[PDB]
Amino acid sequence: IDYRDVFIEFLTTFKGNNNQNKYIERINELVAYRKKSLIIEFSDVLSFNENLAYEIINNTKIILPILEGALYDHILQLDPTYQRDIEKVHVRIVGIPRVIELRKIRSTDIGKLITIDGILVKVTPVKERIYKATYKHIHPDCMQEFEWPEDEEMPEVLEMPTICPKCGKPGQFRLIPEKTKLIDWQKAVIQERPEEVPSGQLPRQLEIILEDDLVDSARPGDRVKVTGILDIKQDSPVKRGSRAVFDIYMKVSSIEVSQKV
Amino acid sequence: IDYRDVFIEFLTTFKGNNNQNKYIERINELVAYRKKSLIIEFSDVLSFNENLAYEIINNTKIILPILEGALYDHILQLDPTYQRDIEKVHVRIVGIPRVIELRKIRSTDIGKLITIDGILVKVTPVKERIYKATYKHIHPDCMQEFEWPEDEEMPEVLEMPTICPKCGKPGQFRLIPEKTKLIDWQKAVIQERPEEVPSGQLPRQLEIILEDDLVDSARPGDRVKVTGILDIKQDSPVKRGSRAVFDIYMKVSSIEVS
Ligand SMILES: [Zn+2]
Ligand SMILES: [Zn+2]
């Protein structure tokens, strides 16, 4: 099953409510204004091809990078000069049928693409962090180079590399010039909407991470629907077998805002 | 995809505006006058092969040393005596379609080959640092010489070789004076052109590093287009309330002086 092909067929052939190619126009804007995210409505995908739609929301980790590669490929065929300005693109899914109430989150929701509908309580100022860099462990027994961070995600905290992935020991790490990339990042807290908070109880809260072009997408007081993979965050618990109570967070993949006046 | 081969094809077959082999002639001048840099116009590369052109500007750190090796190899076949005078050559790309205004630099520009068009404000006097070292493994079973680093130039700071690349064992390594080589370097500051500086505000500035034959390429007051990879410094940032966390600089790969 080649989901790459059906995705491109979807973008180029899907007809909207007015019999217009909704996603051809969204892609042209993206190209014309050098934006790097394409917003896709889940229901549009469902109507076009259900297998694709369910692949997107149930096999997200694996499928999304494949769709993003296909989109980038498609954009470069429309305008080869796009790669001068933008090196990678995001596919951001909105309106998925897995809206979960904060109060009802369960252990099986971890690792899934979910939506939380709540109120943004606070937001940190935008910071740049190292997205990818190469370091050398300056130590007689090692002197090896490694990429850092290992994966492509920063759970709530920003840092420099403290323990070496090659030899497992700390020490001095030299940044290798001209191999560093940066990304914008901020942390925010989303809170239960007042109508969901039972009388006599405090609102539940969730930490979220907004990266790249999702930074400054909303301000305190706004009502927001954030879609992302719910994940656990190792806040140095005594061991691994400590059941995580509040040590969850969401890396946001899409956001819809109802703006507070 | 063998970009080494396409690069040599480009240099030897590209036809200019007057149907002449522009880069054969530039290479001959380089050989005849013992220059060590070949200047390449981005638009020429784009016309010849777009994949190569975009590899050069988007995968610069990896691809450029490969192209420079291929060029050196090609020059030594034309004139083997060139190696008597010049040990290393530079491929310097000009006229790239990524001119960025200093005031508009963003975090995603870090790590990219960019061009800044500005005014040279300050330049330090030229100094010399070690760019290549040869060592001898002082051990009865070995006594062989080797370059270090292996297939790249020495970074700003020396790194002492601990394991021998010839025999795979540690020991005593003697630095060879006569095979250890120096490179000229200087630091400069480029500044926003007056026409870009808004009323009531100071010009933005950027620290740049000029090495080898790029040294003394311009003087204070000159308007310059510098192309290089925008990079961060590793240091104590101590940035109180700043959105930008890291100080930045450019190691210059090409310069045009208008
Ligand atoms: Zn190590
Ligand atoms: Zn040896």
Curated annotation (Swiss-Prot), chain A:
Function: Presumptive replicative helicase. Has ATPase and DNA helicase activities. The latter preferentially melts 5'-tailed oligonucleotides and is stimulated by the SSB protein (single-stranded DNA binding protein). The active ATPase sites in the MCM ring are formed through the interaction surfaces of two neighboring subunits such that a critical structure of a conserved arginine finger motif is provided in trans relative to the ATP-binding site of the Walker A box of the adjacent subunit.
Subunit details: Homohexamers. Forms a complex with SSB.
Family label: Belongs to the MCM family.
Protein name (database record): Minichromosome maintenance protein MCM
Gene: MCM
Part of the full-length chain shown: 8 to 268 of 686
